Subunit: 240 residues, 4 copies
Amino acid sequence: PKLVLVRHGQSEWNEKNLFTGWVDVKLSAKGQQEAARAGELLKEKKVYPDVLYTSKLSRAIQTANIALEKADRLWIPVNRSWRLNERHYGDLQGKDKAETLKKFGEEKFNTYRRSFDVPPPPIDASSPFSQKGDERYKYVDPNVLPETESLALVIDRLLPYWQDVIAKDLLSGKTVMIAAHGNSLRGLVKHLEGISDADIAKLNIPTGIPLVFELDENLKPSKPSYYLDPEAAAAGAAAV
Amino acid sequence: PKLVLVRHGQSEWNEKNLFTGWVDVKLSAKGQQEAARAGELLKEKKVYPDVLYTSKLSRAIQTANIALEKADRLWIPVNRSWRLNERHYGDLQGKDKAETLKKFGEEKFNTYRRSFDVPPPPIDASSPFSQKGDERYKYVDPNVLPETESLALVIDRLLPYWQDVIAKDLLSGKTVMIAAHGNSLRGLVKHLEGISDADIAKLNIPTGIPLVFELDENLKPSKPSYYLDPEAAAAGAAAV
Amino acid sequence: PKLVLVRHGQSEWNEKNLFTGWVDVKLSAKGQQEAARAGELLKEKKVYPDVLYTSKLSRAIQTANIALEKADRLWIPVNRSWRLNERHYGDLQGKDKAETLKKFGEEKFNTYRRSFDVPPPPIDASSPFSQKGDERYKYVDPNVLPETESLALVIDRLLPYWQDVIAKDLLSGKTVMIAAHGNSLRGLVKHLEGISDADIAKLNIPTGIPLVFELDENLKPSKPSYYLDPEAAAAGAAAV
Amino acid sequence: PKLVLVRHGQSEWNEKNLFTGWVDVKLSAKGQQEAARAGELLKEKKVYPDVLYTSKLSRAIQTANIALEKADRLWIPVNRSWRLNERHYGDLQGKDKAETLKKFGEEKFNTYRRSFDVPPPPIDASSPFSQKGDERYKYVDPNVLPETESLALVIDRLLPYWQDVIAKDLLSGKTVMIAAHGNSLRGLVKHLEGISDADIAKLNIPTGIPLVFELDENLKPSKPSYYLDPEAAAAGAAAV
């Protein structure tokens, strides 16, 4: 089976230096161009997805819609799940990254941003940046929607969706495309590749360049994953 | 329940004067702006669909994607069906409308364009504009795909989808949005309003302006349908 | 692909000589044994369905449940639809077949029972045997539910389900089993085999014996259909 | 919302004293009678489920089919998931309970049978009682299918199904019926009622008597759960 992962490009809050998490902000103008590039790469390299999965956040959905327009595959069915959403940033949602760094110090800042298992403080329900009660989550058990998450917790809520729903299409022979976010894709890669809890902190997935996995019958990589544009495939950080 | 209908704006072949039918062309630049306007009207009139239905033709899917981005409702579930597709134009697909008019004369040309039950001539299998074997229809019974259609035949294949699938959402209390095509929407409007076979030749649905039906528990209009921009009505522009 | 059709065995009103149609009666004791036999034949002939389709009438659902228990395939997915329902018998539902014969004469009685296109008289709304407002049809467009049907009308409402939903499973390589009724299966067999309007009045499908179609990629029979117990064929018993 | 839980009655292996786990054995004759009683109780007490969820194990599916036949609600849609299956008994699958008790001692026997978090030893893939490769699990990620489970592990794989799928129907206003097994229902009850890790070991759910939960908008009990037949509702053990 073949799995294609696309991380959305810059959002309007990334350009203003604000932590986003589950706040539903749109792509910036550069983000829209990165999505177009992703779709041009699917077309140039002839990777034609049969089914699309997205999160419930607009920035990843806009990305997929632009990419699939460029790759001429807009007609494919689409499924969306909260379990592919970005990590919830707790009380850091809506805060300035430079102001947060000065407030907490580099140590705490880097623990919140990149520890495997230390989540940022929980957000308050009265906060304007809380998603409690948002309409797009009204049919999910209200007790499972997070008030903060670490990457470990993202993985725990992402896996069951991979196991029962995405895997069914891969095992049926479909090429699946996932349009999602930095932490939810980092979580999935950790799982497929078997990256340790300590090393995953160092993994970065460039924005806007599709990552392909060729998997065998047990859904394990049959060869190393590869980006559709290796040169551009970025290891030099954007912000991290 | 509430139903919102949106006809896509101008396609790239409408700009070039060619009959499109099931050929999968994209929106022109004007078409894209008409889609954004439909989205602005949804947002301005506070009409917020809970589920989207599109045909399998890119021009309607692009229209919904742009509209829902402007209405800020990109997260809603999306279902697609061939039964919402434009009428299949048979052997006229890919043909110049002026040349066709010169070749068949006014009388035959307006019959093919607007009779209720006389279809255009069947497309040939060789034709570069036939959709036989197209990947997006591979899971439908091959025997039901049309080689040509009249409005009457469009209605016969649309209604079973309306009866079991769209009706289920409407009867469950969802606001449903349909992004589709001139003849498939004319077909549906003929059914909801009880317009005679003689009279729907005169019905035209403007491009890019959402048409709202408020329906009762029997799925019959409880009040007249209305456009979200009544002033801008009339489809007599861009071809009468 | 492979399709397996099973007509339910005798209902409790068939035993009492009453026209059933959409009235939801249960299997008789004999009917239950006929369902177990169909299951034994599936298991003995190694025909193992991957998905089950039933109507919304208990007698066909009970039949599938007993059969699949005997074939050891109870875990497969199950889909139900009103479009697989028996023909609606109009004002004849709940009526004694002998008394009806005495009241309309042979000629009118055999037309109603077996013409292709003359339906029985419409049921009245008062009737204790009408299904109007029945909870199991509450999510279908109320306007499409029948007040009476002929075989021709059964075929018109069955085919769209066959074309989009059952065909999708067959074209995906699933073996599909349908547990349904004499007229809905006669309707489907007329379509697959190309039996004329004059000739399907003579087609009878025995109760409880699975009928197998081996179909090609166009969903046309690639070889003659066959029963799993050819010897026991003929539906001339329990009414000719 | 209203949730109804039914534990299946005796299987053919329970009567022979063998641990079952995921081995797919059928109900005994007493088990079939207990299922009929469950359905008679739904009818007598007027609890009419709108949707059914079952595991992928025949004993729970047969239970539901018999119960729904007695309550006259066979037409309701049906969904099945491996996540509602019984606890996998690891290497104890297929072993005699008395022979296992003498082999291990009461201490180890009771840890394996009722500890919250100590699973029995893993089963071998070559064992005849292993479910690795079984056809009904072929579309699930092969890496998540267990080789042994404790109740803690059952709960971890059951919860995501409850959170996204079952909860959606409860939140949509449907009365849901779950037909499942002792440990998967004990897991769900632990979660809804907030029973501690140490106390859940003592919880027993009688076979064949529906347990009803009346839940509020956050899916928490609005009043204590109750059995449809309190007297019979058994606390005196069957085997435990």
